[PDB]
């Protein structure tokens, strides 16, 4: 009756052929989506990689152009330490962005006032914050202090083809200095695709920063681009225009016939199976809280699903980005990313068809329950060791400020890395503090031995008897 | 008889729950009491970092502006080689120090004579240490020497909003020249916390440093700070005074709690060990020199009483600190950081109740004795190579010079990491001694093959060993 | 009948002595045969080295004499950011070309114009590229492009023992400059081997490069050597012209002679073969789709054959190289280091007839095909691990530009190699975007877990269970 | 008969100590050598350690004062490009020469001609090595040149409490440059140990070597110490005269004593072996070729003897240097360092009396020969690869120039560690030969693979074998 039934439920694809039914339509479109998918992802991935590298090399630039004293490397570590020091630096940035046009080897535009910085006219603004009263005096101990942060700004605009070297920088409530200016360029390299207008409007912002109140204010450059179309269209676009849209709009129809089709198989299997607990209910015998009935489902459609969910609603959003106003890469290139992962991962249902493939993939889902009992326990254990570490360690090394970041480094260090170099930097503290330097021995001695020679150790055994259950 | 008290006593509290007495009110207090220390750990180690970040960049504003030539790394081999290079640095530190208020861009305050170098109204002290007799003369080999230190010292007084430029030095006979002073600075960071009147004294000690007598003269800046109260509280203070000290005593209190009862606990089980040895007395039977009356314990209670003796003598340090006088931070964190990881290594014994965890516990418990007596053959050779390593390899190499740092190379080496440095670093002597080189190839190859190709994979086979003993 | 025939084709070669036949002629063929590849193998490298070494520290003194403000390291990230830096690199170039007798350690010799972009009496030719039409106006957004490159370029003469200081730059439509001289050195370091007449000629390349239109225009420096006979030859040659022929001869005749023995053999193999099928069929008995008519092949017998075959063809191209016109080597060292690679490789065999290292051999030849099926799987998690990251983390960190670089780097992982400095290059950019750090954080724990914890354990399981199947 | 005599001979320490025969003796004898040996060489490394900094430091004082433009690091690629930089550091050494006892930090006195290159009067001697006959003309093909350097060399002498800025270079037959001083120190840092007549001579040689004739000159200061006596003794010295002396000979005696009674033992065992020869000749049964005739012999007396004979060969050297005219450290570090690792491997002897720390040993023991036997196979592999990467990746990389680097940095490979910077040296040629390009991705990725996933997984499969063997 449901034998046959459940028979060819639970059938092999070439078992499935062989009985009846006609050929494996719903894996050769798998393959085909397969294909689709990871030549969308390259697509997609050189060009972001060629934009990358224009933004990059402009903000090189920007460094090297205004920030004075600047030198490759040094990115961070780059401050101030006198106020004459700053002053020159704020000065040699204005002066810059005034010379600009004469002696910058790109080819920048000027952008007046639009924004909220910027007031009618001004291409620069630079702002300095301060407190709105501060007494500070270190000697007789009293401060007066009251944070309501105060903006007084100059705004300053460019020539076309004075009033701020008059700056009194109120040194003593200073909380930070910034600049203000935004530059207009356009992508000449984008002639290889033949896509030049890309038509960019960097948003240059140079940061003096003093919230720690130190004597040292750390001097940075950040920037923002903002791609446009640099109306100048379809002057080679017309063999373009069509290739990109319609691989997208493929790419979808693909992703959409695979998630109907799973769907379709996932009802068949949830009404198979409510058919198979009302007859077990007829003869009423071999039933328990039933968590096998769960087990009537098919993973490997789960995937699926889940993969073209994600690749179809990642292929709309770069739909967006490259041609309309969508500027949000980094969510698209997630989902693209994980749904290609994804898509790579299904193949090993491909290979458990055969029967030593299905031997090394079955060793692994035997031993993966053991192997997450495991690393709960070790969970515990090194999380212990991270606090400790974190909590005695940080105030000597840098290494280990940040609970990611000594988290990142005891990791790296049960793998064998950066080892020796940690075990220096504790050595270069013996004269500061004996007491914290042989903590530091016992502790990274401690640590590292008993993860590398007690529970690696018992990964591996875990593995191997898994193995040899299943090759008997 | 006994019988059932000794059931009771190695039930689980499943077991305990289902057979008689009420829920579990020790694990549960265990629970909270893990959760209560780690949070107060949390909440200490914030505060540290927070504190430990001023510090440091005072230090590098200082070493910025008292240090000639100083630039960005170079802490080590910063040094004078000549004896104009020594007077114009001395000269720009105490130049530097007289300009700090019209240069520096922090605020600090000078601080006049109260201590053993600073005489009364001096604020700065460079002090020169030469020998009482000394007529070194290379030539003719004479020494005639007699080492009695002279201190000649020179106090500078500070202006309010010459001298030492007679400086000589006595290159002959110099032992080192050192530079004293102290400034207040005030910690307008603590604007976050509210806790602002964290107002310091920074003493700046910078040395001079000819002990080897080698022409080369390090010069090293270091500091200390002494927090205070700055005469100005109670601004924002209301909100925030109640909540450290509370949790401070809640923790005492838990912990407090938790210790009688495993003290309580612990004396049941020594009552009821006596009362075994007794009753076997009565029958007189199976005894032995009685090791296993010792087994009678419970090693998790131990380490639970240890763990809160701890936790205590680490909170009441904290308080200590945290608002009066204490100013040890070392100890403190040790305390509270082993604490930490004590408690949290005490969730393996929630762990081994259940049946598959207890599974990969028993496996390690079991493995253990093989793999310290093991250790203790590889302890043995390993120290052998350490010897040799040292002996052969110190005069060339500057890894291979204290027994602390050849350790600490080969246990990097046996792991995988700065391998093919210490061969190059090997290398880089070829031409000066061959005979060093190659027994550094031999050395290094034996030591590798045989403590990689041979230990670890014992190491494995003992956990693989125990691991299939606990199966079967 | 044909039973004697196999028995002795199958026979070991001890056997073989002992049953009938002469002495092990063609395994001392063999022996020979390595010897005189390995020897040839490392004369032909020590001279590769020595010329090698030359060609690399006259480009570095053609660096240091041509390069404006060039330092040791930093030969990337060496550019220009300004038209007055860009100018003066030229002009030093051009200027110290001119000046080279007069300055350079080196004796260099001018070539007079006998190419391309020389004309007739010009030695060094500046050649400027930009577009036929370009209006590059990044305001009011157009730009009105027609990429066509026009090359402008000027010739300089030197002089015997002005012109292109009026150069102007169009910095608004160039793509490159160029720089392009020749120079005729002598390698006289040519003295030991005494085959003094190495009479080069370096062809220097300097390129100021402007495909990205970024504002930061690198520099570099390339050159190209072409060796040839100086004119001055048989002074110490006639001790060594015979030796390196002679011996490159002989290798050639022994090649020869092994691949003519393994053809006999191989010839014979499949004549026995066709005999075994013919009897095979006249009982007409076990028969199968005959794979194994394929195992009665001897592997040994093709490594040898591929091995001389790559022999006598890279010392053909060897004996062309080192006197006649032919000038590559990169071909030719591949062709050697795989001919000695297999030569190397063949001992195997000769270790196979023992029956301890038989053991060793066969239990890495059982576990072969399981190892390959694993890599299969493990592959196609991989290529999709690398997929993700590549699309994911290309935009923010620069060793995850490329697939191949993305794959080195995954694979340097999965051994414990720059995990700590890929984690904090992660880290450096959490304020950037809290949202790919976070991503960053959960691919690259799962990855090195997954692939640590529960692959490689895999590997040593099959390892082991082949050994175990091969011992028993 | 001979029962009893095998029995006690054979007997291990305690079970002799049971049936006859007083205590220990030389087991206690052996452990109070072990105490002296390690005792002695940790005396022996401090003083080492001490003096070897003070060499350092004043080599480092030397480069700072000598070469023009020194600095830290940067101690290869330090050149000169130019004949007037060339000049300049030529005319720099020497004026600072002149100028030292007016600028140096320490003390040095000048040592006048009493050598080869001194003549009579003169301190420094700059000497310039050219060809007698050289015509090099990279023009017309043409060099005319006959090797005999020739020596012309100009004394400055110095003066007390010209004539070489007339000097010209050749720089078309230069081979080299060279400057000789001496320079008498006294080490006053010497007062710890109150040792303090250690009373060097440096000899500084500074070499502006030409070998390559690459217009690339790099330069070099190398110094040679000569330790003597200063000329005023026994200040302090009578304290510390004995103590060393003393435990030198205690040293030399106790090694003595263990050599003599282990020489006695041998000559047992060669007496029982040939008694038991002769006794089985009169049965006249189970005799073979005899290889346990030499498994009679016990391995351990061996080892200590080699140990004692490396001991007091070292001692006695020690004594000569630390007194007399003996300066050779090298060899009696290594004898000295070998004689220690021996002497604390001798302690796995009195592991192997009991039975658990037996198991442990036996277990290496059992597999010791597996592991040898795959080492020859390795051995093979290794090496044939290690040709292939040498003579294909010499020419580019320079990690792959020496057999004994490519060595090094394979043998690193296969054990983690600077596995991505490799591959990032072989990605920056891809553009110059992506043949060679992908002939490296080939060959590292073959090679590590091959040796992390094939090797070391047979190598633990060997040794839980053995385990496995030996527990059961
Ligand atoms: C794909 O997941 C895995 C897949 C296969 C095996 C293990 C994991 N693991 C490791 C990955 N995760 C770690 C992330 C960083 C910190 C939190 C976890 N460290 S741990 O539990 O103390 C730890 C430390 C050493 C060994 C085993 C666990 C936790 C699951
Ligand atoms: C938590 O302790 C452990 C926990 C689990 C396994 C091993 C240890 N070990 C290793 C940690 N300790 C070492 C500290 C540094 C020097 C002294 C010891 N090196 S070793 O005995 O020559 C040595 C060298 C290689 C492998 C095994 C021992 C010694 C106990
Ligand atoms: C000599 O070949 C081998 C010999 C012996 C064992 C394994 C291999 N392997 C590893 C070498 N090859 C890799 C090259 C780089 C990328 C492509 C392959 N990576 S992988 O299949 O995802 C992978 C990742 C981790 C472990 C096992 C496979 C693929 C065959
Ligand atoms: C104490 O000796 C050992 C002790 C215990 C195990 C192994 C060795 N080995 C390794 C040490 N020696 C190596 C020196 C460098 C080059 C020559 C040899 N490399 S290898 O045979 O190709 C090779 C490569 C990978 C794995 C195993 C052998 C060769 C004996």
Same mark, same amino acid.
């Given at each position: ?8 439920? =639970? &059938? ?66 780059? %401050?101030? $330490?006198?106020?004459?020091? *700053? /002053?020159?630096?704020?000065?040699? %940035?204005?002066?810059? $962005? ?11 535009? /000027? ?22 009263? #501060?007494?500070?005096?270190? %000697? ?39 600049? +203000? ?18 038509? /960019? ?24 681009? +903002? ?31 695979? =998630? ?59 739909? #967006? ?60 254990? /090194? ?10 360690? #940080? ?14 480094? *005891?990791?790296? *260090?049960?793998? #064998?890395?950066? &080892? ?32 590398? $020679? &007690? ?11 898994? $193995? ?5």
């Amino acid at each position: 009756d449901l034998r046959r039934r459940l028979k060819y439920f =639970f &059938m092999s694809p070439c078992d499935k052929f062989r009985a009846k039914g006609r050929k494996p339509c719903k894996l050769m479109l798998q393959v085909v989506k397969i294909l689709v998918v990871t030549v969308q992802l390259i697509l997609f991935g050189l060009s972001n990689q060629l934009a990358v590298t224009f933004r990059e090399e402009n903000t090189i630039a920007f460094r090297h152009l205004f920030l004075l004293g600047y030198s490759d490397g040094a990115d961070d570590t780059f %401050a101030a $330490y006198t106020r004459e020091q *700053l /002053y020159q630096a704020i000065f040699h %940035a204005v002066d810059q $962005y005034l010379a600009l046009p004469d002696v910058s080897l790109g080819r920048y535009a /000027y952008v007046r006032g639009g924004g909220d910085p910027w007031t009618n006219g001004s291409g620069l603004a630079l702002c300095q914050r301060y407190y709105h009263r #501060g007494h500070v005096d270190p %000697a007789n101990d009293t401060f007066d202090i009251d944070p309501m942060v105060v903006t007084d700004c100059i705004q300053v605009d460019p020539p076309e083809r004075s009033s701020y070297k008059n700056l009194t920088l109120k040194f003593h409530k200073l909380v930070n200095v910034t600049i +203000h200016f935004r530059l207009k360029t356009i992508n000449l390299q984008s002639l290889i695709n033949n896509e030049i207008p890309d038509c /960019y409007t960097f948003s240059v912002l140079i940061t003096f920063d003093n919230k720690a109140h130190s004597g040292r204010i750390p001097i940075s450059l950040e920037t923002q681009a +903002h791609i446009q179309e640099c109306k100048h269209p379809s002057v080679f676009q017309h063999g373009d225009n069509s290739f990109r849209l319609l691989f997208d709009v493929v790419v979808i129809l693909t992703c959409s016939l695979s =998630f109907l089709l799973c769907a379709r198989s996932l009802l068949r299997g949830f009404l198979l199976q409510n058919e198979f607990v009302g007859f077990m209910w007829r003869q009423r015998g071999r039933v328990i809280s039933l968590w096998e009935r769960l087990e009537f489902v098919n993973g490997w459609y789960i995937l699926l699903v889940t993969s073209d969910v994600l690749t179809i609603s990642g292929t709309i959003m770069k739909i #967006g980005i490259e041609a309309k106003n969508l500027a949000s890469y980094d969510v698209c290139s997630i989902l693209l990313g994980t749904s290609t992962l994804l898509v790579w991962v299904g193949v090993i249902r491909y290979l458990t068809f055969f029967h030593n493939y299905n031997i090394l993939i079955a060793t692994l889902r035997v031993a993966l329950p053991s192997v997450m009992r495991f690393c709960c326990c070790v969970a515990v254990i /090194y999380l212990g060791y991270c606090f400790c570490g974190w909590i005695v360690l #940080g105030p000597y090394h840098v290494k280990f400020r940040s609970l990611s970041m000594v988290s990142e480094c *005891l990791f790296s *260090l049960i793998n #064998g890395d950066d &080892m020796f170099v940690t075990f220096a930097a504790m050595q270069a503290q013996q004269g500061r503090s004996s007491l914290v330097w042989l903590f530091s021995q016992l502790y990274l001695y401690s640590f590292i031995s008993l993860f590398i $020679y &007690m529970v690696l150790s018992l990964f591996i055994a875990l593995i191997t008897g898994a $193995y040899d259950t299943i090759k008997h």
